[PDB]
Amino acid sequence: MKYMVYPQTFALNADRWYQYFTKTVFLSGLPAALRAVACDCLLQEHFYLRRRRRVHRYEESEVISLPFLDQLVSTLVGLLSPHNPALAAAALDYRCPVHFYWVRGEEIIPRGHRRGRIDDLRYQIDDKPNNQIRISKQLAEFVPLDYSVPIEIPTIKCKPDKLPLFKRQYENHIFVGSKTADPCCYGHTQFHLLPDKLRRERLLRQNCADQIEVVFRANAIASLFAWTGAQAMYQGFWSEADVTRPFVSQAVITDGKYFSFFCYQLNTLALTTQADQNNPRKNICWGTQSKPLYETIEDNDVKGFNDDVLLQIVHFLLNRPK
Amino acid sequence: ADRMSKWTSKRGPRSFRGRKGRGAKGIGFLTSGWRFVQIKEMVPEFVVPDLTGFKLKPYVSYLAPESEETPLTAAQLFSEAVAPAIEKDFKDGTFDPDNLEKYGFEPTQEGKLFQLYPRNFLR
């Protein structure tokens, strides 16, 4: 029996809890004709391409927003291929699953025939990001290992169950987006699109207006830990034999209008109680607030295109292994 | 092999456990791919007043004198609502056996938002 960790979550204040499970310190901040191609993809989905069957408001995220994000990634990567030779050779996946399975902490079974025995907590995270870019050579770290930070890991008083989280038993999976035999094992960038259930106007409908940023943050931490976690395992590292270099990846999370950016460094897989006992080393996640790409779209133009948001997409793509 | 216990949604196989419920009044419908559509209008809205500057409290002073219990009937309601208007209009020639609707009577309940029979409101 393992907990099923959902990257995209409706749990209140789920960022705090996810930090506990992954032993992650969250840090605020980071460690041309592209505008033309960017806005053209927006206009393609929203306006230019005409729809036989009328678009329902529940279906809009899957039929408008999702193919847009498909399009933007594929164009930008091709266009920036002359700038960055890594992205030329890089493999990109559409809706490929990513799995990670780790153990953190212990419990004593409260009831039953096994009551009062020691058991460990298992956590399984299964995620299907909209887009991801894989590379043959690892990206360079942001900060070294043993990079001490004066910020404490959040601790949860009660059971992990009290945040709505549920135990189920199935196949334990480690997976980077492809099997082991594929040479492109290392991770560049992930693009996520939030479900229509976790939309901001719905979250304004419930009193939880302060949780919009939690959703973005929670998605990043979990999915990135999972992705880097998995990559480290493909290099033979695990709980007992911890990592000898940092493993880094970066993520772009959107709702189709608002964009967030995150960088993750995995420093440790020593999460098991025995391994964790004496280890000051921590995983680090950087991130920033969601910013609107565009104010609105009326007919044939986008109002108030914010360029800096588009460039932050460029700056992430421009990162190359040294 | 039990007959005497109350039958509940806890009790059947998988399909059975889905179908039955407790007493709760449903608030929408289901569509393709088991998507639940909520209707805002099907959801009861609590019509709750303003309580500021309100003198009445939930208990009563014992100092209050006792009075004889007399329930409400249609006869006395007519006497203290409609009857004074009728008799006042009987003094002059304004009263009429036709178009007595002026006194508050209605021929039909069909148009009304709050229909008395059959009742169409909650409490």
Binding site: - | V48, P49, L51, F54, L56, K57, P58, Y59, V60, S61, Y62, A64, E66, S67, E68, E69, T70, P71, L72, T73, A74, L77, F78, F105, E106, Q109, L116, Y117, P118, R119
Partner: protein, 176 residues
């Protein structure tokens, strides 16, 4: 706020709380229509406080401070509901002359007994309703004998009751 699920902290665990008398039906009839509606929420909040207080005593394995309060509150609201009900009922008589708010009919079930069948609301008319037409609102002949036996049974029980009444009076005469 959430705080008003509990009473004034000053009277927490006081063994005794001095409380007023329950509202009378007469008192509530004098009260306005709108004012009854307002009073009714005042009584609502009060009930919930006392109900949570009941449960907390039960948990701590302690006696409640003044348990009779709950009874008073309940009675008041019973009274209020009755008063309001009366007004609606009166108005129905004056407007439609219908004694019952919900429509229904005397019907004959399959067990051959007479029932007051209450109607439900439907979108479609009755002849088109498959589920409704499944119901049998009549008794076939085989039922009549059972009706006989049932009647006979009722009579027996009654006869037995009568006898015992008489017998009891007799012994009560010999002793006095």
């Amino acid at each position: 706020g959430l705080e008003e699920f509990f009473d004034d902290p000053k009277n927490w665990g006081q063994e005794k709380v001095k409380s007023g008398a329950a509202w009378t039906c007469q008192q509530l009839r004098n009260k306005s229509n709108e004012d009854l509606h307002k009073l009714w929420y005042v009584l609502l909040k009060e009930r919930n406080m006392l109900l949570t207080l009941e449960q907390e005593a039960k948990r701590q394995r302690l006696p409640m401070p003044s348990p009779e309060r709950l009874d008073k509150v309940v009675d008041s609201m019973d009274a209020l509901d009755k008063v309001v009900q009366e007004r609606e009922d009166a108005l129905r008589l004056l407007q439609t002359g219908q004694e019952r708010a919900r429509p229904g009919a005397w019907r004959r079930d399959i067990f051959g007994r007479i029932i007051w069948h209450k109607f439900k609301q439907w979108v479609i008319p009755w002849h088109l309703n498959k589920r409704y037409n499944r119901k049998r609102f009549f008794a076939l002949p085989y039922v009549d004998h059972f009706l006989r036996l049932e009647r006979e049974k009722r009579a027996r029980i009654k006869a037995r009751k009568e006898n015992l009444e008489r017998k009891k009076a007799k012994i009560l005469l010999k002793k006095f």
